Design a protein around this ligand. Structure first.
Ligand SMILES: CC(=O)N[C@@H]1[C@@H](O)[C@H](O)[C@@H](CO)O[C@H]1O
Ligand SMILES: CC(=O)N[C@@H]1[C@@H](O)[C@H](O)[C@@H](CO)O[C@H]1O
Length: 139
């Protein structure tokens, strides 16, 4: 028996514990419009720091999920979170073919044991994958 899941791409940007989407934890899932301070980490990632109680925690967020509104003197930048997700044509979640899925994108996927949820795009000829943490299942 095959099954289908109705999913909605979350209204958040992904502040991960590493500059990678695969095998990373969310330090923050900042609602769209959240104001943050960040530093450029590499060509595609920003980094910054939050407080988990008494502990400083470093996080990484993809360049397209942070709209830079001003640059500070000290090299850091002020940005507003631009919430969106990705699906990839590979289970590395790193380059290849990927689609920017707008916040609130409604999709249908299938139960995935390995946590790479399939999205068939009609207009493309192929399967893309989205990790669990980028969407909600409507109950
Ligand atoms: C990513 C981000 O915005 N980090 C800031 C940090 O830079 C700042 O020192 C602190 C002040 O409370 O609050 C955190 O939210
Ligand atoms: C959405 C996506 O996977 N983007 C990746 C980025 O994470 C990575 O830093 C870089 C490696 O050079 O290649 C980009 O294509």
């Amino acid at each position: 028996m095959m099954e289908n899941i109705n999913i909605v791409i979350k209204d958040v940007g992904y502040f991960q514990d590493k500059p990678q989407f695969l095998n990373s934890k969310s330090v923050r899932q900042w609602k769209h419009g959240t104001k943050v301070k960040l530093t450029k980490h590499n060509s595609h990632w920003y980094t910054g720091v939050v407080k988990d109680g008494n502990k400083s925690v470093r996080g990484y967020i993809y360049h397209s999920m942070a709209k830079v509104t001003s640059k500070n003197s000290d090299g850091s930048v002020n940005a507003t979170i631009n919430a969106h997700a990705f699906c990839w044509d590979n289970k590395k979640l790193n380059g290849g073919d990927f689609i920017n899925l707008k916040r609130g994108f409604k999709g249908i996927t299938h139960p995935a044991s390995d946590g790479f949820y399939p999205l068939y795009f009609a207009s493309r000829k192929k399967t893309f994958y989205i990790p669990r943490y980028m969407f909600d299942i409507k109950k």
